[PDB]
Design a binder for this molecule. Structure first.
Ligand SMILES: Nc1ncnc2c1ncn2[C@@H]1O[C@H](COP(=O)(O)OP(=O)(O)OP(=O)(O)O)[C@@H](O)[C@H]1O
Ligand SMILES: Nc1ncnc2c1ncn2[C@@H]1O[C@H](COP(=O)(O)OP(=O)(O)OP(=O)(O)O)[C@@H](O)[C@H]1O
Ligand SMILES: [Mg+2]
Ligand SMILES: [Mg+2]
Lengths: 592, 120, 240
């Protein structure tokens, strides 16, 4: 590339000196000059006609002269920024000399160089101020000409996508302005520890403008940024991914024995999905996934296809770590010697084979761990819970393998015979073994139930639990004990109903939870019935919790990493990789 | 495989079932008992097979420190799952320990236990 | 009063918090523990003041007869009120007692407990639960003895604990009898644990900040300050 940019005013001999600044000559030269007639293009034309190989051009701003007015200044700034964007080389930053012109366009060009990158911002000066070509030729021969250099300037590497979004606009007027950077500059402080919620310390290396744009409120137009961000999912049920659509159809087709499957059953469609305008009961939500689940994944082929499709969706959503809950007893039948253990073994083997295959090809891969969900309902008998706990404890002892059981889950419970306050004797074994414990303590459960889950079971993560506001002691214990909280904005938004739900005034407490310091994480619950992956699940927070910031999203990701049931070495490696990827994407996503 | 092969030839064989051993160490890793119990339970889900897990064994030294009066909570699950419990209490068989094994543990078999004449 | 008068003149000050030691006597008045607990709870209702009690300490002899396997009923109330619990199980600390302190007592930070190397499951549980361990290098070096102590080849487990990922803090226990302040306690790691790096000292500071019994907003304010001060002192030391 090696493109030089200069601003020419009354003086015209600065351009040859800027050309001679490099010790091997330039390759392309473009000069932006004002519409004033003082500038003489004849000298530049005759100087650059001696070297046809280099490229020369001249741009004049129509309707501007001497830039003595606020409207004139803003129009000149906009036109100069557009010209700078147009002549950016595709890969290499361009050199820029701003000696020519009055302090106005000089300062504007320096600001543009800071904003859009500049391989070398340099000045040219001489003792006698030469005018003719012979004068500065003799000056450079003697060495009088000095090339002031203030150092390389990386600029902010992602601002050129504006060029892809802003047309050439060769013929335009004063209306066509792009104050998309001045808005953040005004919004610096126009709104305590928010600077210190800085996760992934390499964000400190980021440009100041990028650090600022991180602090601006999240907007619905950041779908690309959210999708490109590596994410962590901790609440993603396996049985609710291929509920309906093409994925369910191909899962059904890939069954080993499709004769026994029930393809006639279809789930009723709720109008307005996924942003339904009416509240949905938990029982109806569970029934909505009856197309998939226990009744379908009994055969090996359907289960393997469903797991492969779920992993494909996970790696397509840039999720770099996910914990999937599976219930082996739902997919186990003794007719074909398919026990719960063999079902869990098949799921684990498929996940580890997919992970190893993806990693061998040196592509982006999603490390996946499994939670054995121990739903304590059954037909009123607790042998199911003991069987699930024993299965998880034995599944830990596999040891070798990438994907492994990390913890258990408790769900499918209401109260009394199902309350968690009467199982700690069983849970002594699972705690001694080393498994983690996660609770589904939502469904408007009493705060005493949450207390029992936190203390009696020593649970490390609580599902949903949106009623923490009504119990200040519960919030104090949760924050002080560093107990993570997982919520699904789409699932809890449809099931319960939060603003902007019509005829609903309750607000999502995610912003308040983040302000209070709860280790809150964002998840997907069931991908299929909810019909929204992690990307839109995070994007909806711009409406569910207005006023949230991108820095809060990165804090969400950091909390998800911190509260995951992983070994310390793996957690450190994951944190390092996540920080590097986040820095890279943020450095190449402020372009738009 | 051995049992089926013997049955195919239509001769005398020996049907065999397996009891896991809940060995006691108290030299660290006290969760071993639980692990063993869990193992037994999940093996019951094999379902098929002429040979199958039929219960657990309470092997190990059975002095006062290692009595069966502390582990009813762990054994509630193994009793719920249908396994039979055998107590390997041999020497230093205090009558209180055997009573606890019989009643608290709901054991259906006692190993050795040659001191029953002392406690009518 | 001291903290307020130090803040008024706008200088460096040391924010402090209180811990009520619920030690064990066994020479009578066995209710003392309960009394201490009650006292702590009542004093939490002070509300105001930059200095307030944030937890209790389970000091005293740590034999089996007075282990943490009897006091769950008493400690349910202190857990409910909102006081953190620190276990002083460092002497004759059987792994069962430490496990009971972690789970039955819901201890948020252990005291000493230098024998975690032998028990892998206990160390794994401590690492996973993110519970801190406070070790004073000078006190443990004088009492237990570690290299380069003559006729003592035992290695201090601080470096291994840090490598494993435990949240380990360095303290003084008693400034008087030990005769060494916090700076000397950190300095002694040069020969107590060979190979420890300065970044590991910063890790120790971060762990001590994280495991401290403080409110979240105060914790983040402290973390921001600490970031500024550490940056300043590191820059000054490197430039000079
Ligand atoms: N599950 C079993 N366990 C032990 N013995 C069995 C079992 N099933 C069958 N048997 C016995 O094995 C024997 C097979 O041998 P056989 O058919 O010649 O009968 P037999 O007249 O008793 O002569 P033999 O001495 O060979 O047993 C049968 O007698 C049968 O009663
Ligand atoms: N509770 C505290 N205890 C100790 N230091 C504190 C405390 N709170 C704030 N500080 C820090 O004390 C310093 C007050 O002095 P100042 O505002 O001049 O900052 P400074 O540039 O570091 O200069 P100085 O040497 O005076 O600290 C602040 O940096 C502040 O972050
Ligand atoms: Mg769920
Ligand atoms: Mg002490």
């Amino acid at each position: 590339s090696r493109v030089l940019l200069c601003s020419a005013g009354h003086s015209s001999m600065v351009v040859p000196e800027a050309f001679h600044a490099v010790p091997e000559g330039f390759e392309e030269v473009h000069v932006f000059t004002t519409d004033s007639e003082k500038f003489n293009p004849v000298v530049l034309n005759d100087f650059f006609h001696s070297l046809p190989n280099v490229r020369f051009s001249i741009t004049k701003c129509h309707g501007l002269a001497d830039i003595l007015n606020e409207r004139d200044f803003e129009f000149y700034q906009e036109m100069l920024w557009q010209w700078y964007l147009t002549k950016m080389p595709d890969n290499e930053l361009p050199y820029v000399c701003l000696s020519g012109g009055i302090k106005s366009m000089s300062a504007s060009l320096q600001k543009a160089a800071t904003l859009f990158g500049a391989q070398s911002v340099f000045h040219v000066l001489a003792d006698n101020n030469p005018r003719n070509i012979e004068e500065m030729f003799d000056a450079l021969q003697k060495g009088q000409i000095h090339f002031i250099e203030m150092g390389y300037e990386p600029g902010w590497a992602a601002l050129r996508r504006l060029k892809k979004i802003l047309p050439i606009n060769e013929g335009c007027s004063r209306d066509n302005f792009k104050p998309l950077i001045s808005k953040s500059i005004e919004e610096i402080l126009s709104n305590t520890g928010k600077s210190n919620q800085l996760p992934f310390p390499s964000l400190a290396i980021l440009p100041p403008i990028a650090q600022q744009w991180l602090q601006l409120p999240l907007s619905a137009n950041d779908g690309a940024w959210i999708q490109n961000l590596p994410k962590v999912d901790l609440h993603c049920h396996l049985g609710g991914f291929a509920t309906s659509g093409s994925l369910l159809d191909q899962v059904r087709g890939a069954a080993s024995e499709p004769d026994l499957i029930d393809r006639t059953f279809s789930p009723q469609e709720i109008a307005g999905w996924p942003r339904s305008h009416k509240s949905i009961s938990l029982d109806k939500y569970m029934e909505l996934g009856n197309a998939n689940g226990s009744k379908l994944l009994k055969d090996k082929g359907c289960l393997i296809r469903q797991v492969e499709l779920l992993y494909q969706s996970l790696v397509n959503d840039n999720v770099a770590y996910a914990e999937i809950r599976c219930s082996p007893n739902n997919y186990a039948d003794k007719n074909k010697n398919r026990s719960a253990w063999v079902v869990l073994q098949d799921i684990n083997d498929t996940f580890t084979r997919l992970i190893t295959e993806a990693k061998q090809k040196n592509q982006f891969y999603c490390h996946v761990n499994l939670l054995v969900i121990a739903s304590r309902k059954f037909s009123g008998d607790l042998s199911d819970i003991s069987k699930h706990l024993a299965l998880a404890i034995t599944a830990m002892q596999q040891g070798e393998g990438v994907c492994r059981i990390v913890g258990v889950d408790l769900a499918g419970f209401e109260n009394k015979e199902t309350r968690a306050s009467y199982y700690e004797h069983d849970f002594k074994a699972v705690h001694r073994c080393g498994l983690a414990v996660t609770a589904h303590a939502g469904e408007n459960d009493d705060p005493e139930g949450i207390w029992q889950a936190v203390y009696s079971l020593h649970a490390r993560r609580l599902g949903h639990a949106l009623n923490l506001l009504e119990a200040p002691d519960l919030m104090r214990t949760v924050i002080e004990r560093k107990i993570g909280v997982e919520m699904c904005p789409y699932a809890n938004y449809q099931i319960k109903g939060f603003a902007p739900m019509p005829n609903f005034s309750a607000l999502y407490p995610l912003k308040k939870y983040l302000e209070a310091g709860i280790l809150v994480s964002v998840n997907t619950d069931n991908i299929g019935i909810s019909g929204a992956n992690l990307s839109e699940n995070l994007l909806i927070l711009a409406d569910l919790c207005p006023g949230i910031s991108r820095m809060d999203v990165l804090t969400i990701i950091r909390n998800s990493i911190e509260t995951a049931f992983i070994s310390h070495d793996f957690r450190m490696e994951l944190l390092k990789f996540f920080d590097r990827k986040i820095y890279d994407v943020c450095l190449i996503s402020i372009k738009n």
